[PDB]
């Protein structure tokens, strides 16, 4: 079941998207996050993304809506191409391994300000074989329902 700490984790994630902290994610903020990950969505695609999860139809995503759709999405596994694309966002040098520094780099680009300890903690949890890095196979497991 959903725990308190998991809720706080999702709340942290919501704050990543909610740049101005006004309690809602707009198409503008979603576009901002996507571009910082190197993706180039259109205005129409951003509207459609939000429409899919905007339960009250008001044009923006609040925390309950964010929590609802994210918890649902975690119960699904995305296609290999979708996962492989996400992996390349992190594996910048393309060597097949996500290092702490590469994770630091993405999180920084997202505007988040993590400590070296916090990043290592993330790597450690995703790491399976214990080499201190995340390969594609481990990345796939992490994203697997």
């Amino acid at each position: 079941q959903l725990t308190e700490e998991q809720i706080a984790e999702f709340k942290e994630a919501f704050s990543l998207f909610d740049k101005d902290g006004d309690g809602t994610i707009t198409t503008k903020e979603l576009g901002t996050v996507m571009r910082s990950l190197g993706q180039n969505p259109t205005e129409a695609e951003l509207q459609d993304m939000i429409n899919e999860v905007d339960a009250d139809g008001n044009g923006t995503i609040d925390f309950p809506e964010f929590l609802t759709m994210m918890a649902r999405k975690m119960k699904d596994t995305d296609s290999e191409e979708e996962i492989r694309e996400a992996f390349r966002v992190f594996d910048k040098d393309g060597n097949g391994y996500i290092s702490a520094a590469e994770l630091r780099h993405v999180m920084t680009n997202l505007g988040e300000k993590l400590t070296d300890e916090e990043v290592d903690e993330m790597i450690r949890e995703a790491d399976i074989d214990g080499d201190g890095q995340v390969n594609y196979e481990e990345f796939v497991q992490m994203m697997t329902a």
Binding site: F10, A13, Q39, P41, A44, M74, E82, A86, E125, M142
Partner: peptide
């Protein structure tokens, strides 16, 4: 740590892909 912050941004890719229209 359940990596839900990291997992949330990764979920964006498939979320976006599902709405794409070719130019």
């Amino acid at each position: 740590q359940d990596l839900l912050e990291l997992k949330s941004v990764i979920k964006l890719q498939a979320w976006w892909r599902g709405t794409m229209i070719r130019r």
